[PDB]
Design a protein around this nucleic acid. Structure first.
Lengths: 77, 50, 46, 63, 102, 93
RNA sequence: UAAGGUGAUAUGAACCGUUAUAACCGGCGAUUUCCGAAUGGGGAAACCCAGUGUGUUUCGACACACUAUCAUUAACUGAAUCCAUAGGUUAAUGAGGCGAACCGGGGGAACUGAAACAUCUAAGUACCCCGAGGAAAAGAAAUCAACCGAGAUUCCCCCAGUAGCGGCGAGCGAACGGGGAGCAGCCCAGAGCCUGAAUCAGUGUGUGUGUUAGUGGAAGCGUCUGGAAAGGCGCGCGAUACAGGGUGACAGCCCCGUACACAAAAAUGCACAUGCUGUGAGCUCGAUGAGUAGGGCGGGACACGUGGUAUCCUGUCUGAAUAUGGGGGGACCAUCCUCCAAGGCUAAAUACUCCUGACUGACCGAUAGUGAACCAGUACCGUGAGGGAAAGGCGAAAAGAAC
């Protein structure tokens, strides 16, 4: 899949465009590392699909608001 | 002339159709014999052809 | 000589029979092209 | 036989098959093989009327 | 509504012998009527499997088109067109020619 | 109680067979038709309730359906059940 | 609605008759075996083999009601672990499979054109997969404009083979603006006042408008030629109807059809009125769109090969302000204009034709037109996916085989 869910990123097409300037493909892939949390909204600990520089968004939105957004995105925790 | 009801037929009698002065066609003036255009319709057609 | 074709229908049924085509994605499309042609020999193989 | 009976309850009409037609229903089987009954009306009367009670048995679970 | 059927007599318009009231013996699902006292066909038919018999033919009445026969008018010895459902009262044939049945 | 009389869809018309139709058809053996759905599990008691007689031995077979008729494209008899039944007495209505 | 009918090839017994459901046909219901989505579960397709629920022993398991699966919601059950959760289950709601095309998304070519070839082009097109409505999709300004104005979208004719991109080559081609078809606008980011007002939805019913099962619809004869007239002769009759099929030679008056007039116990497409049941208008005071915008790095898509590259998108880097605020006006700076992004609904002009109904051909006529006018997607070819033939019109009538 290569889906990160927290920042919603997807792999994207992209061309190499380097010397001798052939029209060959190169692509770009985003990252996914996954992480374990304590959330207080639950009696248990949970694991979420999250990425490098993506956990920076949890500090903006609040952990309970990301727990609810990933629930609205159908995630299993 | 054009009537409320009498705007259609004869047809099945062959070589016939009923027609009014609006958009008078040149085929009606040569594809048949002695046309039944009236002494008042000749005045109406002069105002449609200027 | 032998013209690459043996007498055995068990070898045919297991690939071209109704259960061997209706269960597979492309075999269930052979059945649809057969119907779309109007062909009476839909799958045979028995 | 009726096919509709308003509030007369169909639970009592199953007896028509299980007792009242019994020992005459389909009785020409094995016992007659010629087709020469000479009662071509009776063979049409022993058909379709038994289906109207089956149309009425649709509501038989009502109480 | 359908014409001729079997109860009426016909005066005949097709290329057969005319001058008599054709009585309808039978009507066919092929669009034909069989008329008595009008025309005959020969037919000798297939012989029997045993063994020596005299010569003889069937000689039977002919079928003609139900659409080229016209019904006898019961007034002037001729045929007439009839019309369907009269303009007043009960559902009956119009009998255009003189407005009377039989 | 136990079962209803819908079990009694047993035996169909007699047919011709040199094993019966020669000297046995009203005294030992008769060859019968059988319905597409009918019991072979309670057949000894089903005849005992519908025809009210006992049968000692009965075997059921189909042999072969012929396909060679009225062709055009050739018409078939299909398989249908036939039985060699020991009823020992005649029945007509 | 009619006297012949119990389908047909195929007759006939017997019986229903010829009025009361003979026979046939339409609306809207009851249903619809087993395999198949296939769906208790399993197989060598139509077979075999189980469970829960209801009732029961006339006494080696019947016969009815139910049991596949995903998510949502609801209710049972249930570990490490106390609460909890994971695991184990049932049920309604929407979907499921088969289509013809129109329609939204995912992945995604190469012959080719450049008389070669790498950038460009073939093209986000084909193809394979998925989704979804009767239409989809689009939309109610951080839009365009040009110092004057327009004031949501869609398509058609134009703007224009122009402004412009490009081994500057082959290709590709705007935007403003105009003519026309067409045009109700509206809710959230919450909770008050006061009410159930705006605007709808579902079904019922009334009314209008469309389509229905169905019924009616004008006139001619004899003689002559011939096998026979629809043609000749004698002349009459009709015509919103002398389109078409014809029929024994050429029919308005013989048949079917046509122009026309009626009809529906009742169904069903569209739009209002209205009961029931959900929905709920205005004004006030709050809340006011953030990992977003601006700006780098490397690319994609925009006519535009990154260039003077704005725009739209973002793998990656940096990351606000939020009204002494912020976007855009094809780099950038300034001024001025013009809007207020980072949330949804949605007219109609539009697309297509499985299907319904009306209808036509200076088109073909059996080596044609579909491969197929006919037991043809059959015969037949091949392990198979797949490929695929030959075959039309007696006569007025079997009058077609007596002896």
């Amino acid at each position: 899949s290569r889906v990160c869910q927290v920042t919603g990123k997807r792999p994207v097409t992209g061309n190499n465009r380097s010397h001798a300037l052939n029209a060959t493909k190169r692509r770009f892939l985003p990252n996914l590392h996954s992480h374990r949390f304590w959330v207080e909204s639950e009696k248990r600990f949970v694991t979420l699909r999250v990425s490098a520089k993506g956990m920076r968004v949890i500090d903006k939105k609040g952990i309970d608001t990301v727990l609810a957004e990933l629930r609205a995105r159908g995630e299993k925790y | 002339e054009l009537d409320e009801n009498l705007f259609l037929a004869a047809r099945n009698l062959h070589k016939v159709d009923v027609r009014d002065a609006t958009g008078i066609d040149p085929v009606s003036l040569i594809a048949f014999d002695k046309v039944v255009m009236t002494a008042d319709a000749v005045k109406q057609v002069e105002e449609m052809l200027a | 000589m032998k013209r690459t074709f043996q007498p055995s229908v068990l070898k045919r049924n297991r690939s071209h029979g109704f259960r061997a085509r209706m269960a597979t994605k492309n075999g269930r499309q052979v059945l649809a092209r057969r119907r779309a042609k109007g062909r009476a020999r839909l799958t045979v193989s028995k | 036989m009726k096919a509709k009976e308003l509030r007369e309850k169909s639970v009592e009409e199953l007896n028509t098959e299980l007792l009242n037609l019994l020992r005459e229903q389909f009785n020409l089987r094995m016992q007659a093989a010629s087709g020469q009954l000479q009662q071509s009306h009776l063979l049409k009367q022993v058909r379709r009327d038994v289906a109207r009670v089956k149309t009425l048995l649709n509501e038989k679970a009502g109480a | 509504a359908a014409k001729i059927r079997r109860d009426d007599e016909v005066i005949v318009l097709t290329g057969k012998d005319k001058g008599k009231r054709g009585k309808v013996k039978n009507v066919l699902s092929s669009g034909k009527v069989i008329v008595e006292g009008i025309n005959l066909v020969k037919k000798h038919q297939k012989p029997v499997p045993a063994l020596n018999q005299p010569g003889g033919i069937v000689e039977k009445e002919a079928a003609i088109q139900v659409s080229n026969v016209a019904i006898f008018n019961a007034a002037t010895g001729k045929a007439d067109r009839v019309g369907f459902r009269f303009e007043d009262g009960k559902k009956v044939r119009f009998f255009k020619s003189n407005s009377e049945t039989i | 109680m136990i079962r209803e009389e819908r079990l009694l869809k047993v035996l169909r018309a007699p047919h011709v067979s040199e094993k019966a139709s020669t000297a046995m058809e009203k005294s030992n053996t008769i060859v019968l038709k059988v319905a597409k759905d009918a019991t072979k599990a309670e057949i000894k008691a089903a005849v005992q309730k519908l025809f009210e007689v006992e049968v000692e031995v009965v075997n059921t077979l189909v042999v072969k359906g012929k396909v060679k008729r009225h062709g055009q494209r050739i018409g078939r008899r299909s398989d249908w059940k036939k039985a060699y039944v020991t009823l020992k007495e005649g029945q007509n209505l």
